[PDB]
Design a protein around this ligand. Structure first.
Ligand SMILES: *[C@@H]1O[C@H](CO)[C@@H](O[C@@H]2O[C@H](CO)[C@@H](O[C@@H]3O[C@H](CO[C@H]4O[C@H](CO)[C@@H](O)[C@H](O)[C@@H]4O)[C@@H](O)[C@H](O[C@H]4O[C@H](CO)[C@@H](O)[C@H](O)[C@@H]4O[C@H]4O[C@H](CO)[C@@H](O)[C@H](O)[C@@H]4O)[C@@H]3O)[C@H](O)[C@H]2NC(C)=O)[C@H](O)[C@H]1NC(C)=O
Ligand SMILES: *[C@@H]1O[C@H](CO)[C@@H](O[C@@H]2O[C@H](CO)[C@@H](O[C@@H]3O[C@H](CO)[C@@H](O)[C@H](O[C@H]4O[C@H](CO)[C@@H](O)[C@H](O)[C@@H]4O)[C@@H]3O)[C@H](O)[C@H]2NC(C)=O)[C@H](O)[C@H]1NC(C)=O
Ligand SMILES: *[C@@H]1O[C@H](CO)[C@@H](O[C@@H]2O[C@H](CO)[C@@H](O)[C@H](O)[C@H]2NC(C)=O)[C@H](O)[C@H]1NC(C)=O
Ligand SMILES: *[C@@H]1O[C@H](CO)[C@@H](O[C@@H]2O[C@H](CO)[C@@H](O)[C@H](O)[C@H]2NC(C)=O)[C@H](O)[C@H]1NC(C)=O
Ligand SMILES: *[C@@H]1O[C@H](CO)[C@@H](O[C@@H]2O[C@H](CO)[C@@H](O)[C@H](O)[C@H]2NC(C)=O)[C@H](O)[C@H]1NC(C)=O
Ligand SMILES: *[C@@H]1O[C@H](CO)[C@@H](O[C@@H]2O[C@H](CO)[C@@H](O)[C@H](O)[C@H]2NC(C)=O)[C@H](O)[C@H]1NC(C)=O
Ligand SMILES: *[C@@H]1O[C@H](CO)[C@@H](O)[C@H](O)[C@H]1NC(C)=O
Ligand SMILES: *[C@@H]1O[C@H](CO)[C@@H](O)[C@H](O)[C@H]1NC(C)=O
Ligand SMILES: *[C@@H]1O[C@H](CO)[C@@H](O)[C@H](O)[C@H]1NC(C)=O
Ligand SMILES: *[C@@H]1O[C@H](CO)[C@@H](O)[C@H](O)[C@H]1NC(C)=O
Ligand SMILES: *[C@@H]1O[C@H](CO)[C@@H](O)[C@H](O)[C@H]1NC(C)=O
Ligand SMILES: *[C@@H]1O[C@H](CO)[C@@H](O)[C@H](O)[C@H]1NC(C)=O
Lengths: 49, 197, 262
């Protein structure tokens, strides 16, 4: 929610980085608490994994 | 597609919003892929979709998707039940008991909504290609049968080059072709004249 | 519109040996004069089958009408021995109530009926026969959102042969990719209360595009009585096993028939 539901994003020429740790990467929460993604492309791993 | 014959064809159809169209595929994740409609990894078929904002965005429309579920659906399953979802597990009532939600969520399909929230009609065509009688064939025209000459051929989409002669072999009631130990086709049933070559 | 069995005896749940039965055609591919090593869900050799039965009520014994909710898991093996076609069909579903859809498949007096609906089932679903003729069907009360309905021609002419079990029926049920697969075999038997040994191969008969989520299985049986003041049960026995992820060798003869398996 901190990144996906932020009140303000940076411009592309001056992008920001946030580190994520000590948490559960549950991506199903984004079904209720986030806008639908028009793009969701994984290169490293399959999104199902 | 126009050169093939299929032993079975099924058409699965429904309405989703634009942004959900990308989920209608093998190996996908998301609300639709997980809770509403799923295809197998070994999917044989075609997915078609088009924008119908001018038709399916009327005041009287009623389109829903499942938002809450315990677990995931299997490929080609349906679930049309409608009971309250208890996020703590088990069941609940009233919907005022804190952890109770309505399992279905409506699509806000208004005619003035931006692209990605507009309704799309999806049709999925599932195909089978077995050693069995064709039920659906493309718009091909047939020719005279030539025998004892090297020639190209196509029987219900089954192509190759060779010499066609009369067979003395017998086929099972629903056998269309036969193959030997090298998977070389040495016999075919003519689609119009019930004779093995 | 439901039959009532207020006092029923407990099931014996006797265990029987499956022998080498329960094998079925696992492919569409035509084969001949070849041995192939395959994998999938099959009934293990010499596996444990659970017996369930029907028994005529008498003064010293409560009616036995065994119809428990049996897990479907990854596939189910079903077989039965009968003298009068007591078993008519099965119910395939999850919660087996009107909350979700379920499939009801049974052979009635003149036709085989396959329906998928939200059913309000009877406590003890059954068919009734009287005066040498079919009387009524008491499987469910209400049915609403039906999505599948198919009727096949067939004839059932059940009677009292005051004998023993002369025929054995075998079925395999699998639910894969939205399709309910049914395999079938039929042979003569000469037993009273056991499971005939041997080896057999079942052939596919149905491939039904239900899109249903089967986790539970129930059996529909017929009661008999003239004058229809009350009904009783005849004697019948059915056996249930479960399919497991096994590796098996199968041999196809010159005509593509499976003659043996390991
Ligand atoms: C075909 O149709 C059937 C019927 O609808 C469907 O079955 C249902 O499957 C779902 C998903 O598995 C079941 O929902 C879960 O059930 C478990 C178990 O509860 C029952 O079984 C146990 C025995 O194992 C009994 O003791 C119990 O009394 C019930 O009878 C629940 O534990 C689940 O809730 C927990 O896990 C959820 C995870 O998603 C959490 O969201 C939820 O908050 C609960 O978690 C909490 O408790 C945990 C304790 O283990 C703890 O570890 C957590 O951190 C947290 O504190 C959930 O209710 C549903 O019950 C099944 N329905 C029936 C009638 O059995 C099939 O799945 C369907 N087929 C397909 C392919 O979908
Ligand atoms: C199977 O057939 C039956 C008919 O025999 C059919 O029943 C109908 O279901 C609809 C639900 O889609 C009912 O409409 C409801 O009416 C109540 C009024 O009390 C409304 O409150 C309901 O809306 C609530 O739930 C919505 C979520 O679905 C929320 O978005 C909304 O804000 C409300 O909280 C809803 O409009 C209709 O009344 C019944 N009809 C009858 C005769 O019972 C059933 O739906 C069919 N099954 C399927 C899968 O189609
Ligand atoms: C497919 O259509 C052809 C017509 O192009 C059928 O040809 C007939 O063949 C029989 C011999 O078996 C002749 O007696 C008829 O006169 C032919 N019909 C015509 C119009 O010439 C062919 O039999 C059909 N095959 C199948 C399986 O239906
Ligand atoms: C099939 O069922 C029989 C029961 O009749 C099982 O035999 C029992 O196995 C346990 C575990 O070794 C022993 O403690 C019991 O004493 C055995 N009972 C008898 C009567 O011998 C048998 O193991 C089961 N086989 C399978 C594959 O499940
Ligand atoms: C679904 O089944 C339930 C039963 O589990 C039905 O509720 C019963 O309705 C009868 C009247 O026909 C009452 O006599 C029972 O007391 C009710 N039982 C319970 C637990 O409420 C319910 O009406 C059925 N729903 C539908 C739509 O058929
Ligand atoms: C077996 O099932 C069939 C199919 O439902 C029954 O035949 C139908 O009976 C209704 C009247 O209740 C007619 O409106 C339908 O047209 C009949 N179907 C057909 C194909 O003719 C049949 O009566 C049932 N038999 C028994 C003994 O229950
Ligand atoms: C998330 O963003 C929406 C606007 O898109 C806002 O209305 C909502 O209040 C935000 N959630 C929280 C917890 O601030
Ligand atoms: C669904 O989203 C709402 C916010 O609109 C939130 O309050 C609710 O708790 C969410 N549902 C679940 C199960 O988290
Ligand atoms: C018959 O059912 C009743 C319950 O209504 C039970 O109390 C009684 O013991 C049962 N009879 C026998 C022989 O079990
Ligand atoms: C059925 O029984 C009655 C006597 O109750 C008899 O008259 C009738 O002929 C019998 N029907 C048949 C087919 O035997
Ligand atoms: C449901 O079944 C009951 C009989 O138990 C009947 O009275 C009722 O009218 C049926 N419902 C419908 C819609 O027919
Ligand atoms: C194959 O079928 C033929 C009949 O067409 C029969 O004569 C032959 O014995 C069968 N082969 C085997 C191994 O049974």
């Amino acid at each position: 929610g901190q990144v996906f539901n932020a009140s303000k994003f940076p411009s592309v020429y001056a992008w920001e980085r946030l580190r994520i740790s000590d948490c559960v990467a549950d991506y199903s929460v984004l079904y209720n608490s986030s806008s639908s993604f028009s793009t969701f492309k994984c290169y490293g791993v399959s999104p199902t994994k | 597609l126009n050169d093939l014959c299929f032993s079975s064809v099924y058409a699965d159809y429904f309405v989703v919003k634009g942004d959900d169209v990308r989920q209608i595929a093998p190996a996908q994740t998301g609300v639709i892929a997980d809770y509403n409609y799923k295809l197998p990894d070994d999917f044989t078929g075609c997915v078609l979709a088009w924008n119908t904002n001018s038709v399916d965005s009327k005041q009287g429309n009623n389109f829903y998707y499942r938002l809450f579920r315990h677990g995931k659906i299997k490929p080609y399953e349906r679930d049309i039940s409608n009971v309250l979802y208890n996020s703590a597990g088990g069941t609940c009532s009233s919907t005022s008991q804190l952890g109770c939600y309505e399992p279905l969520k409506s699509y806000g399909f208004t005619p003035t909504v931006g692209v990605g929230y507009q309704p799309y009609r999806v049709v999925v065509l599932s195909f089978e290609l077995l050693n069995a009688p064709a039920t659906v064939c493309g718009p091909k025209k047939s020719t005279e049968l030539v025998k004892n000459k090297c020639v190209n051929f196509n029987f219900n989409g089954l192509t190759g080059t060779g010499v066609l002669t009369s067979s003395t072999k017998k086929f099972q009631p629903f056998q269309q072709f036969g193959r030997d130990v090298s998977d070389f086709t040495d016999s075919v049933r003519d689609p119009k004249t019930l004779e093995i070559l | 519109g439901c039959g009532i069995l207020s006092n029923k005896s407990k099931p014996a749940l006797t265990q029987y040996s499956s022998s080498r039965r329960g094998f079925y055609y696992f492919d569409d591919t035509f084969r001949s004069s070849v041995r192939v090593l395959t994998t999938g869900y099959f009934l293990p050799f010499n596996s444990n089958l659970t017996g369930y039965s029907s028994r005529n009520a008498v003064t010293g014994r409560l009616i036995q009408f065994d119809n428990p909710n049996i897990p479907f898991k990854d596939g189910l093996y079903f077989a039965a021995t009968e003298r009068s076609n007591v078993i008519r069909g099965w119910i395939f579903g999850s919660t087996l109530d009107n909350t979700t859809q379920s499939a009801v498949l049974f052979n009635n007096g003149t036709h085989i009926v396959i329906n998928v609906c939200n059913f309000y089932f009877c406590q003890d679903p059954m068919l009734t026969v009287a005066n040498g003729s079919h009387y009524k069907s008491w499987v469910f009360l209400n049915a609403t959102n039906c999505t599948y309905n198919r009727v096949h021609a067939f004839e059932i002419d059940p009677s009292l042969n005051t004998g023993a079990f002369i025929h054995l029926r075998e079925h395999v049920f699998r639910n894969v990719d939205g399709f309910l697969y049914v395999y079938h075999n039929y042979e003569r038997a000469n037993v009273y209360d056991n499971f005939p040994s041997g080896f057999s191969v079942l052939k596919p008969i149905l491939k039904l595009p239900f899109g249903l989520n089967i986790t539970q299985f129930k059996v529909i049986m017929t009661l008999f009585s003239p004058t229809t003041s009350s009904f009783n049960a005849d004697a019948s026995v059915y056996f249930v096993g479960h399919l497991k992820p096994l590796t098996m060798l199968a041999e196809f003869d010159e005509n593509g028939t499976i003659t043996d398996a390991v």
